């Protein structure tokens, strides 16, 4: 999907710009960004940078809080919001 426009994260970006009132990524490298970020859609992709952000993702029953680290940068956020069919 890299061809002809590779990234979709608009509502996540609206919340990210809400976080970006003093620093998007600790420009003031990262300090965990204690204000929680709670998205309402997991179809979003993940953009480079975006590190140390507390993302709360919807599972259809709740919001799942997961801290992003360096490995999950080229992913789509719905991969981290399962339906918990453990057994």
Partner RNA sequence: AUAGAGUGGGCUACAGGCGUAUUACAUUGGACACCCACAAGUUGCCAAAACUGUCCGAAUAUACGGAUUGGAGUAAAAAAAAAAAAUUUUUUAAAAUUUUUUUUUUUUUUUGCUGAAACUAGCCUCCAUGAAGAAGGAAUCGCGAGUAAUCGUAGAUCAUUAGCGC
* Total chain residues near other proteins (CB under 8 A): 8
Phi, psi dihedral angles at 12 (to 5 degrees): -60, -40
Least distance (Å) between residue 38 CB and RNA: 12
Residues that bind RNA (CB under 7 A): 1-5, 8, 40-43, 45, 58-61, 76-79, 83, 85, 87
Interface pick for other proteins out of 13, 16, 66, 76 (rule CB under 8 A): 66
Measure the CA–CA gap between 8 and 12, rounded to whole angstroms. Answer: 9
CB atoms within 10 A of CB 81: 19
Residues after which a C–N gap over 2.5 Å breaks the chain: 28
Between 25 and 59, CB nearer to RNA: 59
Residue 10 engages other proteins in binding (rule: CB under 8 A): no
Cβ contact 67:54 at 8 Å = yes
Least distance (Å) between residue 69 CB and other proteins: 8
């Amino acid at each position: 999907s890299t061809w002809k426009g590779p990234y979709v994260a608009v509502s996540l970006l609206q919340e990210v710009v809400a976080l970006a009132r003093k620093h998007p990524n600790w420009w003031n490298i990262g300090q965990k960004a204690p204000e929680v970020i709670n998205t309402y859609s997991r179809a979003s992709v993940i953009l480079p940078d975006f590190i140390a952000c507390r993302f709360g993702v919807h599972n259809g029953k709740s919001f799942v809080g997961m801290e992003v680290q360096e490995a999950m940068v080229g992913h789509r956020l719905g991969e981290f919001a399962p339906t918990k069919a453990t057994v």
